[PDB]
Amino acid sequence: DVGGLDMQKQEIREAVELPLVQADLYEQIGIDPPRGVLLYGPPGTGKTMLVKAVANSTKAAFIRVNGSEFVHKYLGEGPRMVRDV
Amino acid sequence: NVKDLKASQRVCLRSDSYMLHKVLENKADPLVSLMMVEKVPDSTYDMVGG
Amino acid sequence: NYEVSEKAFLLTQSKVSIEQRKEAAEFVLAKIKEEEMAPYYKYLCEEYLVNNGQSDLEHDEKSDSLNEWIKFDQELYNELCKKNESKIKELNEKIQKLEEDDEGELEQAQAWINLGEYYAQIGDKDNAEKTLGKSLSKAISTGAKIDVMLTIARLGFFYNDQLYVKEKLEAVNSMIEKGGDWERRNRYKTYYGIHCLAVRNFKEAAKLLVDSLATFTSIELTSYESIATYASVTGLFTLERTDLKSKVIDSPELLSLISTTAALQSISSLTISLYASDYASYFPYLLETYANVLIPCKYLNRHADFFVREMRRKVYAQLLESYKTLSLKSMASAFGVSVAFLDNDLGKFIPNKQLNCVIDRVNGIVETNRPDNKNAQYHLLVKQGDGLLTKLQKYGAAVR
Amino acid sequence: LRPGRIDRKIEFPPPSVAARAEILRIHSRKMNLTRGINLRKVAEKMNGCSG
Amino acid sequence: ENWDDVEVDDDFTNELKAELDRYKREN
């Protein structure tokens, strides 16, 4: 439903679903796959609206957790979140 | 003995008495925090021209 | 220097097409005057007896090529000695100014690189291998090792060996780093399928030798017309008829060959006759392709007629599965073949376990069968009877 | 900047027709391409791209 | 390589041209 970014949104299935399905295409190219993903900008303007749209195209196990204070301010509950996640 | 104990070595210690039992392992593999030192990097002869 | 490599070999494998040998002969005498190579031009003449249609008159009377002299004589030494010992002592003199002053890590390595490559033009044995390793130890990167690899890679057309060429380069090729290197794919996949041509596996070469990533050839390894020829010849033997339209014509390399070089003749003959399942037209194109492809072929020319007789029936064997009841003389008379010779080749394929089908002669009722059953299902265990116990009772003598 | 604290300040060559094929002659090793790729001719159609 | 590989009867050349000439002369 959300269009207009399709020029920059070509990476939705290329940077997410493509390496999980076909892993031999990156070997037939020779460039590093889009592993690290960083997105900077105002949230809620369609930046985050695209994030919630990933689960629709995927329809699989999806984990969305916002770390802000999610790490503890005292010893040992922080390391709980550092590992096992 | 004290002659065979190298500096910064992982050993074993008792719970209540804290007595040293035996030397378990050696110095940890990772050094400091962020180590960018690289010998013979990925660039050998031709990577960036000019 | 790929032209020197191919013309020093192809002349041996051609017993037909005098015009084809002239290109493998007239292009030798012209280049040997420029080069320094005495012995490797003589080794070509050392193989004479027990051959067909050579270019020289010594023991036999033939010499059917237009160039009648392949012999090595002392007349080559006129222009040979000019650039032979002059450039060796000159380039080695620059090395004296290298190790003393220790200028750069390239100049010490590039010196022997300009030597080992030039030693191939001198035609020396130990100088093109042992002394070339001096620069191999100075440069540990895999990028500079290509010249060391290409020197041994071109020995396949020099010493004429399909075995020890990759054996000496096996440790050099593998190493550690592999990755997605493009130039390494053309070097490994080309020579890999060549070694399997004697074993006749052909399956591991279908996705490697037959399938070429580069549209144009690699020069010093093989030829553009040669790399496109082996894809059609071997591809029809391995890939089925369904994969013919999904792969061979799918690749753009074939579309460029159709509109340029029609001399192969296998694109409009073996491909169309197999796709249309027409044995009548497929028969006369066997010898026409055999003459212009398999005879000039530099690899499979050794074993040819037996390789053709196998694929000759396979075109008709697949068509047999389509029809249930067919007489002997109905469509076979229009195919342009004789009934007597048709049964002779098929009669010898019975001990090879290549016929489960129904073939009859005196009556002529010809049917098809189902090679998938519970007989060949159990045959896997019988074949492993003597092969599984070979090493079990061997080393169990002193140990265990 | 002193005579012998800092000896010379090296200046790099600006990009040009021959400087646009700089990385094209190296990175093309690990990257899959075809034989119809002319490193010098395709670089003539580019601009402001060297290293 | 079994005997079928080292056999090489070299009869494929003559038998192919002969059968093509026999069919054309039956017209």
mmCIF file of N, CA and C in Angstrom, chain E:
data_model
loop_
_atom_site.group_PDB
_atom_site.id
_atom_site.type_symbol
_atom_site.label_atom_id
_atom_site.label_comp_id
_atom_site.label_asym_id
_atom_site.label_seq_id
_atom_site.Cartn_x
_atom_site.Cartn_y
_atom_site.Cartn_z
ATOM 1 N N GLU E 1 39.898 -48.937 -19.099
ATOM 2 C CA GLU E 1 39.321 -49.100 -20.428
ATOM 3 C C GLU E 1 39.271 -50.571 -20.827
ATOM 4 N N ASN E 2 38.076 -51.050 -21.159
ATOM 5 C CA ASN E 2 37.883 -52.442 -21.540
ATOM 6 C C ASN E 2 38.247 -52.626 -23.013
ATOM 7 N N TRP E 3 37.940 -53.806 -23.558
ATOM 8 C CA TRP E 3 38.281 -54.093 -24.948
ATOM 9 C C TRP E 3 37.491 -53.224 -25.918
ATOM 10 N N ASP E 4 36.289 -52.792 -25.530
ATOM 11 C CA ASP E 4 35.482 -51.961 -26.416
ATOM 12 C C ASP E 4 36.132 -50.605 -26.665
ATOM 13 N N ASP E 5 36.938 -50.121 -25.718
ATOM 14 C CA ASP E 5 37.604 -48.835 -25.889
ATOM 15 C C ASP E 5 38.834 -48.952 -26.781
ATOM 16 N N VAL E 6 39.564 -50.062 -26.676
ATOM 17 C CA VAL E 6 40.820 -50.245 -27.396
ATOM 18 C C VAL E 6 40.578 -50.978 -28.710
ATOM 19 N N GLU E 7 39.310 -51.225 -29.037
ATOM 20 C CA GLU E 7 38.979 -51.995 -30.231
ATOM 21 C C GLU E 7 39.234 -51.172 -31.489
ATOM 22 N N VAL E 8 38.418 -50.139 -31.709
ATOM 23 C CA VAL E 8 38.615 -49.176 -32.790
ATOM 24 C C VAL E 8 38.665 -49.910 -34.128
ATOM 25 N N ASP E 9 37.509 -50.401 -34.583
ATOM 26 C CA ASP E 9 37.456 -51.135 -35.843
ATOM 27 C C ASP E 9 37.644 -50.237 -37.058
ATOM 28 N N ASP E 10 37.400 -48.930 -36.923
ATOM 29 C CA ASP E 10 37.523 -47.973 -38.026
ATOM 30 C C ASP E 10 36.607 -48.326 -39.195
ATOM 31 N N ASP E 11 35.508 -49.023 -38.914
ATOM 32 C CA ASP E 11 34.532 -49.386 -39.931
ATOM 33 C C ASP E 11 33.368 -48.407 -40.009
ATOM 34 N N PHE E 12 33.345 -47.384 -39.150
ATOM 35 C CA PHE E 12 32.232 -46.443 -39.149
ATOM 36 C C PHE E 12 32.257 -45.535 -40.372
ATOM 37 N N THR E 13 33.437 -45.296 -40.944
ATOM 38 C CA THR E 13 33.538 -44.393 -42.087
ATOM 39 C C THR E 13 32.989 -45.039 -43.353
ATOM 40 N N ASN E 14 33.376 -46.288 -43.619
ATOM 41 C CA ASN E 14 32.963 -46.947 -44.853
ATOM 42 C C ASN E 14 31.498 -47.366 -44.812
ATOM 43 N N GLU E 15 31.014 -47.814 -43.652
ATOM 44 C CA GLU E 15 29.633 -48.272 -43.553
ATOM 45 C C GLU E 15 28.630 -47.129 -43.629
ATOM 46 N N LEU E 16 29.034 -45.907 -43.279
ATOM 47 C CA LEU E 16 28.112 -44.778 -43.345
ATOM 48 C C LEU E 16 27.902 -44.322 -44.784
ATOM 49 N N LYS E 17 28.990 -44.182 -45.546
ATOM 50 C CA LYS E 17 28.872 -43.731 -46.928
ATOM 51 C C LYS E 17 28.219 -44.787 -47.810
ATOM 52 N N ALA E 18 28.408 -46.069 -47.486
ATOM 53 C CA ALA E 18 27.821 -47.130 -48.298
ATOM 54 C C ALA E 18 26.305 -47.162 -48.161
ATOM 55 N N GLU E 19 25.793 -47.025 -46.935
ATOM 56 C CA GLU E 19 24.349 -47.078 -46.727
ATOM 57 C C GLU E 19 23.642 -45.879 -47.346
ATOM 58 N N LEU E 20 24.305 -44.720 -47.391
ATOM 59 C CA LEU E 20 23.700 -43.556 -48.029
ATOM 60 C C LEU E 20 23.608 -43.728 -49.539
ATOM 61 N N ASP E 21 24.591 -44.396 -50.147
ATOM 62 C CA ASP E 21 24.558 -44.619 -51.587
ATOM 63 C C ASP E 21 23.569 -45.710 -51.976
ATOM 64 N N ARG E 22 23.323 -46.674 -51.085
ATOM 65 C CA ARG E 22 22.372 -47.738 -51.396
ATOM 66 C C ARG E 22 20.942 -47.214 -51.415
ATOM 67 N N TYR E 23 20.602 -46.319 -50.485
ATOM 68 C CA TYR E 23 19.242 -45.793 -50.430
ATOM 69 C C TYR E 23 18.945 -44.863 -51.598
ATOM 70 N N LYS E 24 19.944 -44.107 -52.061
ATOM 71 C CA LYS E 24 19.716 -43.187 -53.170
ATOM 72 C C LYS E 24 19.560 -43.924 -54.494
ATOM 73 N N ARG E 25 20.144 -45.114 -54.614
ATOM 74 C CA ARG E 25 20.048 -45.898 -55.839
ATOM 75 C C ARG E 25 18.793 -46.758 -55.906
ATOM 76 N N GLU E 26 18.023 -46.843 -54.822
ATOM 77 C CA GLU E 26 16.775 -47.593 -54.827
ATOM 78 C C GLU E 26 15.601 -46.790 -55.373
ATOM 79 N N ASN E 27 15.809 -45.523 -55.718
ATOM 80 C CA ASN E 27 14.745 -44.687 -56.257
ATOM 81 C C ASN E 27 14.385 -45.159 -57.664
#
